[model samples]
Target chain A: STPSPALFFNTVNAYQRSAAIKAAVELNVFTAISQGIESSQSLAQKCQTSERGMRMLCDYLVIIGFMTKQAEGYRLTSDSAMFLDRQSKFYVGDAIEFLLSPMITNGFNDLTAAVLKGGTAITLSPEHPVWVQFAKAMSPMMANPAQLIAQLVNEPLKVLDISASHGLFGIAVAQHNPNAEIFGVDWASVLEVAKENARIQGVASRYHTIAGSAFEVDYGNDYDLVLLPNFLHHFDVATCEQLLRKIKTALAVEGKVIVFDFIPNSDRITPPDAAAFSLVMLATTPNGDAYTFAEYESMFSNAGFSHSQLHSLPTTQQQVIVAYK
Target chain B: TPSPALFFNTVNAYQRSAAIKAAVELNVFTAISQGIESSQSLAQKCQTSERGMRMLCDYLVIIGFMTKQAEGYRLTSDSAMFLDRQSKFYVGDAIEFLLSPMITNGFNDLTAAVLKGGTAISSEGTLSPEHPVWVQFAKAMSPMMANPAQLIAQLVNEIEPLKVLDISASHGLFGIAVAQHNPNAEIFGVDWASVLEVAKENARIQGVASRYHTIAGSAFEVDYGNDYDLVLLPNFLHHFDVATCEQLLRKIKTALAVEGKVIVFDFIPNSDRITPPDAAAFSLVMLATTPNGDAYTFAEYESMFSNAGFSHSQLHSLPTTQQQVIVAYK
Candidate 1:
């Protein structure tokens, strides 16, 4: 088929899609509509936004499949009502904090330069405040995955969650195994969030903190398991291999390192979630990637790991690769 | 269907487009189409940093704009056809102009724009008549509008020494095409003086300058002499409310010759106004960006033409693009 420019147009104006949804979410457009405040003017009055602004944005929302216009008003699609409506238990307005944060959204401002340099100018340095936002905004979104990873371990052993932003992974392990001692490693400032979450979940006593850069810190020898959730995709393969080498030294002979990140296939573009993630890494990191399973296996192999196995997590874009040191 | 990934990608998708724009600016696609393959040679040839070229090539591959071989990169079929300078259909030029600061300065905050409407600001985004953006638009958009103008020209075929009036003829391609096809016909383009310069230049470039004439004034205020046999409204009139459009149509009819046909080209959506997505979604563009411009349905156009004293109107769908031709007889 001859290619149409529609795809290019959609991709170029995709920001409007995000902005329209964000504008509605900021104004509780879906929640107001769910309350029978459907007219643009009525919703504007309820949400305290511009009436015309509300209408135009609402119409755009309709254009983008978020709402439907009927009877001089609008109707929320089922998905919008469920996730975008704050009144719904499935609401995800918080995710916007991380999804649209300056780190991610503004990161693209230098995407052209990043492409030239093979990395981002906006580095995710230790103690970056964006981590605090990520730790807070992303916890709910990660809860299921944490629980899923914990189910795999079912361990009563020492756990090192490296760069543990929310401590959810470590905390989940503690939740599953009462005897498991958890150590959360991250910037000192970031640890505050993880520690607070640990306390709230009644796992603080078991969850300890190791502050500072994971690259510089001594991860104390003989950890039964090391959780590298959502972290490895922030560096180049060489950097990842170097860290993997150190983590290998920290682990017991048969101890495992679970890399929970978006892992694409050999094709690197299929399994849309995993593949599209590489672009995010390219945009945000100096040299991180949505590494394929093969790439992960190779990195672990170069780091002196004897065995590695990949496991796909159901319903999530992430795949876990467990490598034994 | 709801996902943070979707939102993240949506919000930053402009990067890919921006990347393509940068590629065009650097002639990266054109270079790849040539013998240059590796980033080193591409950088040396395009005169950029080595790492910069490599990363850009890799990222382009990530976005499916290019394919990567072990040694270097190559263009996709679509990119080759439209992005490379070697291709006559090259549209990548428009990206640099459209995405540049030349287009962004006259904008308003849309968050507030949706409230007070597009007219709240004097700039009117890109709709402000005689805005410098249109000058650039005339140059950049003409290539993209080639198919639309040709399709419309074919539909309005003539050889009877007829006079054609093209309103808001930014590029004047529509009128120029008519003149090109029929040696006996003369085309008149009415637009702001600054914009007419571009159209006039284009008329000269297309070798139809002899038959092309320019009238410098707003379409609503201009006197489009009463002898025009065919009036062309190519991609205009979607910048006003119903009353405004009707007023212009009334004025347009007065300037028409007896039994003359007024051909209006625009996105003619159906009553549902949402099924044909390209036409339907255009409503959002008008709503957010214009004070009262909404993508009108064919029914709306017919009624507007009828109320303005025109007879029946017919809609002709063009296979080339989303636009359609509506001929209302005066």
Candidate 2:
């Protein structure tokens, strides 16, 4: 194949598209378009932005396939309509608050030093204010997947959600089985948000809280299921194995550990969303990685589990792994 | 086959650049070419963690900068010549200029720029008059300028005993090349005092210092002496508006002797402004950085030249680079 410099130039300025989308999302351009603001001038006047700015933004959006420009005016693509438009129930534009936050962006800055040190050069303790913001901004994106995952267990028993920042997963399970009780573990400050989520869902009466590190918490015995959603990727293998071993003792007989994560294939370079997450961990965490299913099997096996099952979270690349003791 | 991989990859392209930057920072490519191929030895030699080196190496392979074989790594053609420090064509340092905060910040707020149709992030953009960054540009970008500079020298007429004027002669390569080819050709470069020093040094390195003269001031303010046989405007017009280019050309035309030709080099796209993708993309770059510059179409160049009192102009492409050269007769 003849080498194309397109890949180089396009990739180098890739952040432009991201920054552009952020501006559009912040401008409510997507929502306005969905509500029949078809022309750039109309969209600009409605959004209190420059008409020229709006025109170029819309044209670039068409170039990136986020929208289309018919002779009549601009139209949102289906993905943009559903996920980017605030008028849609599925919109998660607020998620950029965490995705493109200062810490997440600044983490990639001195990648040279990060690589040399083989770990993160920055830190975000549990009490950081951005934690609650992260919990809130990210929950909307997890709604459909939370529904999909909660249905995995129709007959929910006593459950403990580790690092339950949002508690959406536990609340969904509690909603799924009316009698089921939920136990959430997180920072003392973070539990308030999770508890509030439970209160809104009418599951507060059945949900309990134990605030501390997932590693330090005395997660009581007899839990039928333990939820580890997006937690293990923040630490190294031994750390993950130790956490898994602790959850093994907390579970009741026939109990399973339900983990939601980005699990790549063996090659570690396909299913771009899943595989690319390793670089995310590389940039953001010291030793974290998007482990393969085989690595998960090994970790679970070493933690005394008999079997592990990996399944997809519908409409998203994140995977759910059910491991039993 | 039907996937949004292009979108995903495009958005995350910053990671690709950062990875390469890290590799260059750690001398990974140079070390590998020197037989330090295994991750353990390479990491030890580069003084980075083994785990990180392994991940970085694998990522480089995934991004097509290197290849994986013998359970180690090897440089690709792209990496060996440009990234390896031992090579004469090495441009690892160019990354400093390419990724400089000034340029990055210029494109950082493209939404504002698009609406305004000009740079919006910083008041002191690349077009800052007599910008000091031009000195760094001259030093870091010379290797890249070598090919096109030689091409233009070869394309020029073989007349000796000539006088030449080079506008914004940051490195003076275009002028020095002509002087080297035609022993009797003398060069008068117009640029800022700080930038002309860099050009003077380069002229000395190429052994044409005695023949090269400098006019230390802004190109627009400098009084260029009359009756030059050839004038070089290499990579200059794209940093200005057409009105500005037209005005500058009129001044250049006056300084040219009768029958003298002026060489205007820049990126010229087709009329549709989207073909020859490289040339077309430069407009957005100009949009994001310069106040009024663009990769003008050939038609626009013709109009500009005719309006500036030039009799006839011809366009020719340099085989090696994406840039083009246009020669207009006075």
Candidate 3:
């Protein structure tokens, strides 16, 4: 299908909108407006920016429907007020540090190189500070999914939390199952943040850290459940199979593996959020992808799991894959 | 009225840029039109990793730049005509220029520009008349300007020994176009001396050098000879204030013959200054780039022309371009 001019222009100039938002976040535009500094002149004075530049930026924000321009001044839309205002609990402006951070945004600069190499365009290390930023900034989004996963667990259990960058998944499970004991694994530096989060969530007593690569870590073979939260899409099928095999050996009798990931349709086109995530993987990981349920099933089956089931999470593109041993 | 999802997605939506820039960089559209179908073959032709190429092509499909089938990736008609490098109207270079650090980084400082009430970043550090940036701009922007130049050439009604003055003639394509259309027309172009070199070369290549003369200086200070039949101000006036534009127009009026017409090409926002999105957006560009420049409304242009002693003026929309030509007669 031929893309319309609007779509083409918007697609090409998408960075302008992104940069505008980044500027807004940096200037605390939303917070200033929330504090009743509605006029561009006042905002400029409050934020210590140019009035003309601020006015133009504000006008563009209105055009993008993020703000409303009234005779009184500029007012934040309800959604913007909730998610962009600094005072709101749901404020997601910090997520910009990760989403639009140079670490992630620069990957697309040479996507053809990645396309040719069958991997990520940028070489991102496991210890990159962006992971820490992602862990902190993405908590608001991860909160709901963590709680939903918590609702699925009913008994005291031993949990192996793989790549537990923020420790929220394991902590949520612990919050739900008081007797749940968690072993979280990640890069040593990242594990420090997760350990701190465990303390914050009051799950420190139940949570322990294995600070190393999941492939090399000695995960003691008594995990009642393996929690692969927001990981496992960073390798090829063969590599994923290898990791699954390792996880299988650590499972206790009647234990299960709970995988959280974007599950696209077989056509790889529907559920746009899931489909679009594959591009993120393509840009960020050498062989990562958003796999379909059928693909996940085959991987699970190859790793000696008896049966598998899929659970859709509310308010998220991620799904839970429960594969029993 | 925007969906929350779209709003948030748009706020961080550089993936769209990644897809387009990757395709353009790899010449994916050209390869597809040259009969490379499957991702593997296209990857080979583009000399990129097969898997990376496949993912990129898949993204192109998602963005509607191409289509995917079991057989392979195929270009939409729009992609073939405008995106393919071999196409005469290929806009890749123009887009590349637009996406350059100069413009993209300018937007990055939008907050600073807004707060300071002036340009956050100048095009260069105290740009001189001969800055290389203008040379790059002229070359990069020629493809986009070609169609508009042709349209402007066609709109000119004068036939008898027309003497044309082209102001801010970066590439001289406007003057060259008029000279090509009116065989007897002799063109004079005014711009920085270094920029005029590129414009002179373009005029030579377009085979209009014999009839084109370069006036290497600022339009404000240059001595424009009198009695010109047609004067062209292409994409220049929007860089200054209304008083500046009126002052320039009065000068052009003095230089024009009794029946001569001044054709102004510019972004004319609607009276509300927000209806035409591109035109309105251009005003923001001016705010970020200049101290007092703006995307003026048609009403504003009419008022400026009337103040400058033009009795009649009319707007002509150039097909396939965001600009309009305001033809003013004394």
Off by over 4 Å in 1: A34-56, A68-73, A252-254, A301-304, B1-9, B34-76, B101-110, B119-122, B158-161
Q: What is the C-alpha lDDT of each candidate?
A: 0.78, 0.79, 0.80
| Residue-pair clashes per candidate | 3, 3, 12
lDDT of 3: 0.80
TM-score list, all predictions = 0.89, 0.88, 0.90
* Docking model 2 quality class: acceptable
Give the range where candidate 3 chain B is weakest over 10 consecutive residues by summed lDDT. B123-132
DockQ each: 0.35, 0.36, 0.51
Candidate 2 to truth, TM = 0.88
Q: Distance from true position, residue B72, model 3, in Å?
A: 1.7
Task: Choose 1 or 3, whichever is better by TM-score.
Answer: 3
Q: Docking quality tier of candidate 3?
A: medium
List the RMSD of every prediction in angstroms. 3.4, 3.5, 3.1
lDDT of 3 by residue, A211-270 (tens): 888888899988998999878777778888999999999999999999999887776755
lDDT of 1 by residue, B1-330 (tens): 654444445544555755665676788988888343988988887876675676567667777777867667877788778777898877776754556454432122445555555434455655666767677778788887877888777776642437999999999999998888888888999988998999999989999998999899888887888888888898787778889999999998888888788888887776766647767666656755567787788989999999999988998877667777898998
Q: Which of the two candidates, 2 or 3, achieves a greater lDDT against the reference?
A: 3
User: Model 2, range A172-264, lDDT digits (tens) per residue?
Assistant: 999888989999998888889899899999999999999888888799999888998888888888989999999999989899999998887
Question: Model 3, DockQ value?
Answer: 0.51
